[PDB]
Amino acid sequence: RSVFSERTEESSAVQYFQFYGYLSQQQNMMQDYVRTGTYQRAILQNHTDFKDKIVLDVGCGSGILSFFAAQAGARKIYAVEASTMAQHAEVLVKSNNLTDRIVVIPGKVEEVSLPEQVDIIISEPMGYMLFNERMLESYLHAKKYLKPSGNMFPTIGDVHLAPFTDEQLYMEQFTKANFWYQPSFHGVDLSALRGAAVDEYFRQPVVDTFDIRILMAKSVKYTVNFLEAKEGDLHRIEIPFKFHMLHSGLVHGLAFWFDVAFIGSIMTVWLSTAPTEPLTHWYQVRCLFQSPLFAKAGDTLSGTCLLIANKRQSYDISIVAQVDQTGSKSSNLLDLKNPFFRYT
Amino acid sequence: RSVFSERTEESSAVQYFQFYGYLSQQQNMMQDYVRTGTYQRAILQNHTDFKDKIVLDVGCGSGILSFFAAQAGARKIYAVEASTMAQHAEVLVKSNNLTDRIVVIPGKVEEVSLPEQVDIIISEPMGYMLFNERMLESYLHAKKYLKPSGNMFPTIGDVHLAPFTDEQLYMEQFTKANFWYQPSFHGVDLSALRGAAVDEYFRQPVVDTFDIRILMAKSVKYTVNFLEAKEGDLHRIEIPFKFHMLHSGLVHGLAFWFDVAFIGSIMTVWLSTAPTEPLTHWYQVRCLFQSPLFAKAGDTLSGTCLLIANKRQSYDISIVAQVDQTGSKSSNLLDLKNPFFRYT
Numbered sequence: 104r105s106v107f108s109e110r111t112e113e114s115s116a117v118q119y120f121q122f123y124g125y126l127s128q129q130q131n132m133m134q135d136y137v138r139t140g141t142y143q144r145a146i147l148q149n150h151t152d153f154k155d156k157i158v159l160d161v162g163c164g165s166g167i168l169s170f171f172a173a174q175a176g177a178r179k180i181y182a183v184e185a186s187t188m189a190q191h192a193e194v195l196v197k198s199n200n201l202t203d204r205i206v207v208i209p210g211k212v213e214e215v216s217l218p219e220q221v222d223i224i225i226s227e228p229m230g231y232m233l234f235n236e237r238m239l240e241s242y243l244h245a246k247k248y249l250k251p252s253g254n255m256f257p258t259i260g261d262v263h264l265a266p267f268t269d270e271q272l273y274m275e276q277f278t279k280a281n282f283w284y285q286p287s288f289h290g291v292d293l294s295a296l297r298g299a300a301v302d303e304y305f306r307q308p309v310v311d312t313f314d315i316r317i318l319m320a321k322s323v324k325y326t327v328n329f330l331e332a333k334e335g336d337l338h339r340i341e342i343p344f345k346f347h348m349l350h351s352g353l354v355h356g357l358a359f360w361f362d363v364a365f366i367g368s369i370m371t372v373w374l375s376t377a378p379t380e381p382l383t384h385w386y387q388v389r390c391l392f393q394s395p396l397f398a399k400a401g402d403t404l405s406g407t408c409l410l411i412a413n414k415r416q417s418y419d420i421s422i423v424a425q426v427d428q429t430g431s432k433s434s435n436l437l438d439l440k441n442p443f444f445r446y447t
Numbered sequence: 448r449s450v451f452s453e454r455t456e457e458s459s460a461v462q463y464f465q466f467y468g469y470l471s472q473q474q475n476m477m478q479d480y481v482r483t484g485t486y487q488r489a490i491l492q493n494h495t496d497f498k499d500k501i502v503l504d505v506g507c508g509s510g511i512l513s514f515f516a517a518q519a520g521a522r523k524i525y526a527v528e529a530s531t532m533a534q535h536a537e538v539l540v541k542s543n544n545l546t547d548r549i550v551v552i553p554g555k556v557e558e559v560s561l562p563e564q565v566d567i568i569i570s571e572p573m574g575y576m577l578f579n580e581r582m583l584e585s586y587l588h589a590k591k592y593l594k595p596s597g598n599m600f601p602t603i604g605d606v607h608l609a610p611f612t613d614e615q616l617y618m619e620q621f622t623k624a625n626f627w628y629q630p631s632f633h634g635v636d637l638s639a640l641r642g643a644a645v646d647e648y649f650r651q652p653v654v655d656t657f658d659i660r661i662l663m664a665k666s667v668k669y670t671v672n673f674l675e676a677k678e679g680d681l682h683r684i685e686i687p688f689k690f691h692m693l694h695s696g697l698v699h700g701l702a703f704w705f706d707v708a709f710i711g712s713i714m715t716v717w718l719s720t721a722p723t724e725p726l727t728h729w730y731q732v733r734c735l736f737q738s739p740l741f742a743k744a745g746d747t748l749s750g751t752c753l754l755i756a757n758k759r760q761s762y763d764i765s766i767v768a769q770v771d772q773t774g775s776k777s778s779n780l781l782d783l784k785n786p787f788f789r790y791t
């Protein structure tokens with residue numbers, strides 16, 4: 104029917120809203136102090152962006168960002184939420200005596216009707232590696248409700264990528280896969296599935312944190328401007344790169360992280376998930392090559408990271424990389440939807 | 448329209464078969480040594496139940512059990528598998544040079560055709576707490592292909608339950624929920640949702656192992672005989688109990704585990720997930736009471752554990768219990784499909 108259901112398979116949506124419908128998941132995000140404190144600070148230090156203004160909160164969850172908008176003096180806040188968390192949010196609005204200012208609207212932002220246009224849209228729509236969930240497209244879709252010259256909080260997003268070396272990680276994944284190399288598992292020859300097995304394990308991005316000393320070159324940055332982007336821009340995301348290698352060694356893959364900026368009238372505030380910054384519930388994300396690349400300090404590692412949105416609220420990631428000085432090439436395809444959550 | 452599609456919400460089925468389509472999930476079950484080792488022994492040591500026989504493997508996964516049937520000398524094994532793991536099973540049959548004896552049939556056992564009737568059914572259809580996944584119904588459905596007087600491996604399943612005391616596990620729930628008991632979380636009073644957070648945690652069965660010293664009475668068992676049972680017998684499972692308390696203390700809930708028996712012509716072999724036995728991937732399961740019950744040694748703790756099948760491939764669990772000598776009672780509702788995997 105809607106823009107949402109057209110891009111989203113049934114089973115994915117059901118599973119996705121069940122996950123966010125749990126108080127325990129909302130708590131996990133709320134208790135990321137760097138995340139929640141930075142949102143509150145961006146909003147309160149930019150109070151003139153909220154004072155007597157009309158606000159839309161995309162995917163309000165517990166209602167937390169809407170309470171921050173209210174604290175900053177907003178006249179009216181529409182808090183849209185498609186999971187069963189909406190009913191919990193309406194309980195909090197009543198117990199906090201803000202029924203006159205915060206209006207919970209249950210359902211998908213692609214499907215509801217808002218009574219008026221808004222001055223500013225707030226949301227926390229970043230998945231791991233920024234793009235997981237495809238909730239950035241809901242955030243962009245919501246611009247149908249934004250007044251001309253309205254603002255977006257966050258305003259921009261930067262994705263960073265850098266080559267890394269981590270033989271321990273590589274061998275950890277390699278070792279699980281080589282279960283399927285055994286020629287006599289309880290007398291059975293599994294070895295014909297070894298290739299399929301290496302592919303499966305290496306298709307999984309790795310979600311955890313790491314020491315910055317694994318990084319082999321300065322990060323390449325790709326920027327999404329939320330004020331200017333249309334949701335269609337996010338169907339196919341193409342990030343070319345050329346790294347000037349600062350260290351010699353084996354390149355085991357690319358590491359990803361992201362920052363968003365709240366570009367307000369009074370000040371710009373940054374929220375970062377960089378590995379040089381304090382840890383957040385996003386950690387960082389690594390895509391391994393099953394076939395690692397040898398490079399020397401001063402080489403250039405060049406290629407393309409391509410993200411193709413899929414119906415399961417995620418992206419098919421291809422990473423083609425090469426060491427220019429040798430013509431050594433690595434081609435990889437990752438399933439962002441199904442990663443190894445190594446931090447657990 | 449099949450028996451399977453009628454009892455199963457489409458979206459639960461998609462998620463279910465995706466999960467089993469991964470080699471790492473198959474690998475997880477395979478590497479449970481007690482599990483895979485015991486299947487192998489039970490089949491090989493009952494070689495006359497297999498020698499020159501026709502076999503059905505219900506949900507073959509990688510094909511592992513079917514290879515054991517072949518090691519035991521079966522003439523023809525039909526291996527049925529609904530996930531994309533069926534492709535991989537096919538590869539292994541080829542590379543193990545058994546195309547003449549193992550026939551992989553892709554699809555649901557409720558929907559495929561077998562070209563002949565079989566002598567024995569083999570399967571591993573046991574979920575956590577035995578009943579999760581509702582695959583025991585697929586196994587029983589498969590008896591439409593069994594020759595009169597054919598056998599089933601496993602032949603019977605016993606679920607055991609027993610009351611437990613575990614003050615620290617009980618406390619953990621309030622510690623977690625009390626996140627919400629704050630009047631000023633970044634300025635927001637979260638207190639109104641504390642009761643809801645408590646109810647959420649108590650609704651999740653706890654999947655983990657424990658020390659046998661927590662158990663307060665001898666277990667009661669409930670037996671399914673796979674040779675005799677019909678599918679409809681598993682839609683509503685009523686387990687009455689009268690525990691004669693061996694220890695005085697505070698009863699915090701019921702612990703569950705299960706055993707299966709392979710009743711062959713040569714010998715009966717048992718596979719136990721009891722807390723007195725080495726750990727398996729099934730662990731054990733505990734259902735908490737939000738109100739604990741005081742009992743002293745000698746008392747009788749009586750009531751009913753009722754499992755009601757649902758269209759998400761699992762059960763709604765109702766546990767009602769009382770201490771006969773005092774009349775104090777506790778009533779609990781759990782969602783077996785969404786437990787707390789405490790062991791992770």
Ligand SMILES: CC(C)n1ncc2c(N3CCOCC3)cc(-c3cccc(OC[C@H](O)CN)c3)nc21
Binds near residue numbers: 386
């Ligand atoms: C499809 C999405 C909803 N999803 N599904 C499962 C899942 C997830 N886990 C964590 C480990 O347990 C299994 C599932 C973590 C995460 C996750 C991990 C790190 C950061 C994160 O950020 C969510 C944003 O705050 C939402 N805007 C989310 N996302 C998960």
Ligand SMILES: CC(C)n1ncc2c(N3CCOCC3)cc(-c3cccc(OC[C@H](O)CN)c3)nc21
Binds near residue numbers: 463466571574
């Ligand atoms: C819908 C069912 C298939 N399902 N879905 C997820 C899931 C699961 N996990 C593992 C923990 O992280 C989340 C998912 C474990 C298990 C699980 C846990 C313990 C034992 C177990 O045994 C499976 C049987 O051996 C299959 N015959 C399976 N089942 C899961």
Ligand SMILES: Nc1ncnc2c1ncn2[C@@H]1O[C@H](CSCC[C@H](N)C(=O)O)[C@@H](O)[C@H]1O
Binds near residue numbers: 123212213
């Ligand atoms: N299309 C859509 N319409 C409405 N809500 C959505 C949505 N897509 C995702 N959501 C909701 O958006 C939330 C993102 S998580 C962030 C929750 C909260 N604003 C906070 O910052 O703490 C989830 O609760 C999810 O259910």
Ligand SMILES: Nc1ncnc2c1ncn2[C@@H]1O[C@H](CSCC[C@H](N)C(=O)O)[C@@H](O)[C@H]1O
Binds near residue numbers: 477505509529532582
């Ligand atoms: N109704 C059904 N029809 C066919 N296969 C099914 C099924 N329900 C579950 N399965 C398959 O049954 C398997 C259960 S796990 C057991 C796998 C394998 N027999 C082993 O012992 O290692 C999964 O691979 C699952 O996809």
